[PDB]
């Protein structure tokens, strides 16, 4: 879809990531694994909750009998109720479709933004494979991996080390 | 062959299907169905107050005191009234009732 | 022998949901009647099988 990440450059999902909607996978000599990015996940959830709520709140708002001399009145009544019915059914079905579209794209965008964050952080200290993975030009241990994840990664620290390896 | 980090998204065994403008029958990891299709199939008391069952009496029949309708002679509070489409026991002595429908809209209040 | 806050000719509704397709004519406090056979919000994201 729109942001080109989900079913995008990142080709599939992770059945392996159970803690979140979006996250990381890493491998190094210390080990390998899936990690959810709990912030982005929860925030997206809050957004979706707001969305569906607002759909409920905005939507949240007897018969009669008539004689046989009352044919036009009766029909006027029917046409009215039926009219409002048609209008509300339309509004609902439509609102649901459109918001669905928006929702999927919202998720896509979230992924894209996460990826972007990591990329723009890591710079040329890594190779960017284009599958959603970055291969490091320097040794990245669990502290460094967490630093990437928690947004703190140190470029100048691994800079020239990465440089030499990227070159040779 | 160096150390590696990846970004990705959740997947599960979900069979859940939704439609969009661009696309129909899309599967999603999570969904909420907001339309309620089911009911208990019973006629019930409403806020702990029972409805008035007319049985085979018409509204008119009950208000007039049609003999068959004698079981409705005294009644408590009602949440709503239940009338058959064609009640047997209307006015026994035949005749008419003027402004009948208006009177029903009145009974509804 | 029953209790509801919402009533239709077909039966009674107890639900947390915004809409019902069950019947037009309803007494009590009730979800919005619609003509729809289904209304489903996507919340999670697309399920894309892996490799």
């Amino acid at each position: 879809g729109l942001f080109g990440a989900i079913a995008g450059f990142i080709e599939g999902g992770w059945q392996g990531m159970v803690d979140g909607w979006y996250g990381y996978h890493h491998s190094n000599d210390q080990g390998s694994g899936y990690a959810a990015d709990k912030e982005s996940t929860q925030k997206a959830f809050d957004g979706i909750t707001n969305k569906v709520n607002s759909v409920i709140e905005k939507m949240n708002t007897v018969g009669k009998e008539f004689s046989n001399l009352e044919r036009r009145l009766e029909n006027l009544n029917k046409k009215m109720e039926d009219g409002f019915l048609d209008v509300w059914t339309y509004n609902a079905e439509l609102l649901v479709l459109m918001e669905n579209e928006r929702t999927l794209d919202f998720h896509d965008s979230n992924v894209k933004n996460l990826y972007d964050k990591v990329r723009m952080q890591l710079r040329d200290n890594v190779k960017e494979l284009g599958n959603g993975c970055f291969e490091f030009y320097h040794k990245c241990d669990d502290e460094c991996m967490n630093s990437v994840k928690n947004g703190t990664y140190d470029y100048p620290k691994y800079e020239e080390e990465s440089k030499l390896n990227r070159n040779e | 062959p160096g150390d590696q980090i990846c970004i990705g998204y959740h997947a599960n065994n979900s069979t859940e299907k939704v439609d969009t403008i661009l696309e129909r029958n899309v599967t999603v990891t999570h969904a909420k169905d907001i339309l309620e299709k089911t009911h208990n199939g019973k006629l019930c008391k409403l806020n702990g107050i029972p409805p008035l069952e007319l049985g085979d009496c018409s509204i008119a029949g009950w208000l007039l005191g049609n003999p068959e309708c004698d079981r409705l002679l005294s009644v408590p509070e009602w949440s709503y009234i239940m009338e058959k489409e064609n009640p047997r026991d209307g006015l026994c002595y035949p005749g008419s009732f003027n402004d009948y429908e208006e009177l029903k809209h009145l009974l509804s209040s | 022998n029953c209790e509801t806050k919402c009533q239709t000719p077909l039966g009674a509704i107890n639900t947390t949901l915004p809409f019902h397709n069950v019947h037009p004519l309803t007494i009590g406090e009730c979800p919005k009647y619609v003509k729809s056979e289904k209304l489903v919000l996507a919340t999670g994201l697309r399920n894309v099988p892996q490799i």
């Epitope: 159970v18 909607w21 709990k38 912030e39 996940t41 959830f45 409920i56 | 999570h30 | 949901l17």
Partner: antibody
Framework: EVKLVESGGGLVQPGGSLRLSCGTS????????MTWVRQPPGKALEWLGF??????????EYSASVKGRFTISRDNSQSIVYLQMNTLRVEDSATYYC?????????????WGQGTSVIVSS | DIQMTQSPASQSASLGESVTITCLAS??????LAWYQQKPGKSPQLLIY???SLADGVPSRFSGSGSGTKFSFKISSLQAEDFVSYYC?????????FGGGTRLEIKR
């Protein structure tokens, strides 16, 4: 909104039994990860266990303090999570909450019930 | 299983001041800590999740920090109604343990 309410607390002979009910109300997007947490008065909070949503298989986990005695189950019909406590002991005396995450993923317990207290003595 | 050590168990301070509770994990729970307030005679209320991340509709004066084992929780501008119990909880692995508790008392 959600508003969990719990019920059924009382006094029991040890060896005895009790069944606690936490009912759920309100529109929500998730039933999953319904947890029982108790607080003996003056003491800290202690986590008893949880039961999961239908879709997740109704699976259940327990603290090894109460494991094998207590059982968590849910009747969706009445929309309640029951904690069925058997072979009650003296240290089981505490106040009891059901608590819930709001999300799909259990990062924290967002929704609490109001508590109900059970005592155990001879 | 997993042990959560919260200190100080009791702390006194006065209005407007800044107070810091610590929580310590026997394992590394990564970033799966959460922080709760308990007003007296009430159920707990969620304050922080994912250790450093404010729950919806919470005052900005409440903060949280840390990773792995060491964790911190801070009330920046102290307030009248803030003097109550606080608990950490580890949601990293079952059983989801709690800290000992922290009682906040107002200086007099």
């Amino acid at each position: 909104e959600v508003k969990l309410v719990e019920s059924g607390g009382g006094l029991v002979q040890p060896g005895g039994s009790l069944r606690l009910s936490c009912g759920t109300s309100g529109f929500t997007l998730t039933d999953d990860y319904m947890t029982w947490v108790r607080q003996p008065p003056g003491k800290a909070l202690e986590w008893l266990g949880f039961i999961r949503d239908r879709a997740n298989g109704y699976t259940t986990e327990y603290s090894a303090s109460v494991k094998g005695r207590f059982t968590i189950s849910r009747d969706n019909s009445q929309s309640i999570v029951y904690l069925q406590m058997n072979t009650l002991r003296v240290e089981d005396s505490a106040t009891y909450y059901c608590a819930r995450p709001k999300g799909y993923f259990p990062y924290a317990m967002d929704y609490w019930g109001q508590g109900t207290s059970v005592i155990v003595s001879s | 299983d997993i042990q959560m050590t919260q200190s100080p168990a009791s702390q006194s301070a006065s209005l407007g001041e800044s107070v810091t509770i610590t929580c310590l994990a026997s394992q590394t729970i990564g970033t799966w800590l959460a922080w709760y307030q308990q007003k007296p005679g009430k159920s707990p209320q969620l304050l922080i999740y994912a250790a450093t991340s404010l729950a919806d509709g919470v005052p900005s004066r409440f903060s949280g920090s840390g990773s792995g084992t060491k964790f911190s929780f801070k009330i920046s501008s102290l307030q009248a109604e803030d003097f109550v119990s606080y608990y950490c909880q580890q949601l990293y692995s079952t059983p989801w343990t709690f800290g000992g508790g922290t009682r906040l008392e107002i200086k007099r």
